[PDB]
Design a protein around this ligand. Structure first.
Ligand code: CMP
Ligand code: CMP
Ligand code: CMP
Ligand code: CMP
Lengths: 199, 199, 199, 199
């Protein structure tokens, strides 16, 4: 409950910033919405608290909390639990609101994403609507190829996501090369399903 | 209003430091002036507050706040909004007082500047007074050439500025090479207007 | 005694996190146990406090506190006190609970360990039980060879340990090459005692 | 005066640490002495406070505070004021007590020192007593040659010092190569005065 306190003072700081910068009504709305969904009335130093513990405990926990994510994700579900653990360790949580552009075709990409809860759409130059849902991932292709985002990804609903930064994606994939081919294979299918080809 | 509180305690800390170091009257004046102009009676953790939000929101906002800057700047105004966004993300705000030397001819340079509000003068070995004003930029040439500051830049008024550090200038220019030629071209004109030439 | 205060509020933060994440009874138990053993009712900013001091003092102290460790460790005990000092400077303290897997055969390794108090067991594919105790070290082999953990290490009791990260192991071993051969030699004996061979 | 408060609570934290670690009487004495001399009853966040200001102001100030240091130091006194400014920017303050070993012959070196107030002695294998005093510097030779400390430096009195870390020494010397030869020359004389020779 110290945290249901922090929450309301932080959102008081937020409101101030908005005032000083004179942001428009529907933009203050947008930001207020996101806050509720992002923090849901509570704020605490997740990271700090895990830092006080050792690895074994840190790994039991992350494994427990991400239990449904691992289980509904063919790639994780069917993998070396240790790879899973490595991966889960480096995920950072994120929230997107409906109509947000998580990824823009063209852009340079430094992150990939795991869908916890939500629906998201894959768009190219008239590739129709391709939907990804819980236990799906996107944003891998860019990272592998070191070239540019091969399509745009828009949030169709509120999207609860876990993201993995490029350095982290590569550190882990250094340790588990077998798991690179796993990514690569689904990526060639994805590029094959839309009609693209890459070096 | 928590921030109109912080302000006055921070400037109380400042006054103490000055006392312990026995700084002269007109130097304490100079520092007091700058404080008022730099913070204008208020202090808050801009960065912190943007960190709690996601990218879409962070980008809407920075775009809104820098609206006049983008619009009065041929280079930004006539560019890929995404390049603009990339750029705006990495700008840090700065204040200079009249007669300050923002850049010294000769020096190694690690920053460039965008004039928000103010007037500034370009000086070389008898190149007269060349003035840059709102929606102008300077300090690019050094960064491009990786050699030394090609002229001095003095603040003729109070100058409100946004600066961009070298690593950031290059990260963005990696992503938008077309925009490098834009810089390069105005730079050759600038060196041509004063009579200099560089590898 | 400010620290016997901090302790109880921090463990209050811990309890909250557990609640919000709905961790199971024996896992909250496990975490509560570790806390007592790890901090033993008290928390203070060891690092912070050493940072205020200079090197000479920082070195006297670390030498004093690690007095029994150095003295019961053939490798340290019989070495250049300065090497010892360098080493001791970079050790970070850690606690493991009985049945924890400190190191997993196969894994990539970024740390090595010094046993202060406790017993630990070395396991391979039917290599029986090999026990290491106070003033022993393990996890060196991986670091030297830059290849993978050559066996698993499990905590048989509560284990009080000091660990040394790879960068630190190498920085020091750059300065004291003679001391590399010391490590290398015991490592070849260790690999010889279990029947393994490495490039 | 907020700072004459902080001081006494910090030294209360220090006392606690000592108790928990059961340090000997003359070692608690040694640490208490140093505290008085190092902070002299007051503590404040020098760095923090300079961070709020811009460069021009930051440079005026550091120049003012180090006025006697620059003026009694042939190397600084007779140099490009800008080089001086660059240098002064990166100095960190340090205190040593009588009989401390600031530098040990043999060791790898990552710092050099400027004597503000104090006396210090240069020792080799029977090179007698060579004393350096206010406006002198030492620890340069190592940094230049990238090899090892060429002699030991002991504090003969309480020594008030400013130190410059290797990266910083090189960054500045990149910008002012002329000033490298200045260092190099005095270094060859120093090695010539004791009878040593180096690649
Ligand atoms: N056929 C597909 N089905 C689902 N998702 C896709 C498909 N093709 C591309 N994507 C995703 O859209 C992402 C756009 O960014 P990336 O190129 O980094 O990675 C791309 C894929 O992860
Ligand atoms: N002809 C010009 N008109 C306006 N500004 C200039 C001109 N020439 C040089 N400058 C600016 O002065 C700056 C001095 O530092 P730089 O060499 O980094 O970059 C230089 C330019 O940005
Ligand atoms: N014969 C042995 N006796 C004791 N410890 C060992 C022996 N062989 C290996 N180990 C330790 O087990 C560790 C497993 O990880 P490393 O390969 O990094 O380093 C290994 C050694 O430090
Ligand atoms: N002849 C000398 N007179 C004064 N100081 C010296 C002399 N020779 C060496 N020193 C200092 O002692 C220092 C020992 O460490 P360094 O080799 O890094 O740098 C050395 C010099 O800065």
């Amino acid at each position: 409950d110290s945290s249901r306190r922090q929450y309301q003072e932080k959102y008081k700081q937020v409101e101030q910033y908005m005032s000083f910068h004179k942001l428009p009504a529907d933009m203050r709305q947008k930001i207020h919405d996101y806050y509720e969904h992002r923090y849901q009335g509570k704020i605490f130093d997740e990271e700090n608290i895990l830092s006080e513990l050792n690895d074994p405990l840190r790994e039991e926990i992350v494994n427990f909390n991400c239990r449904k994510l691992v289980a509904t994700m063919p790639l994780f579900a069917n993998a070396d639990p240790n790879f899973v653990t490595a991966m889960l360790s480096k995920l950072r949580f994120e929230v997107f609101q409906p109509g947000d552009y998580i990824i823009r075709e063209g852009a340079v990409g430094k992150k990939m994403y795991f869908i916890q809860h939500g629906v998201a759409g894959v768009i190219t130059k008239s590739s129709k609507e391709m939907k990804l849902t819980d236990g799906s991932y996107f944003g891998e292709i860019c990272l592998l190829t070191k070239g540019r985002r091969t399509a745009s990804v828009r949030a169709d609903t509120y999207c609860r996501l876990y993201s993995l930064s490029v350095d982290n994606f590569n550190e882990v994939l250094e340790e588990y090369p077998m798991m690179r081919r796993a990514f690569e294979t689904v990526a060639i299918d994805r590029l094959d399903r839309i009609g693209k080809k890459n070096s």
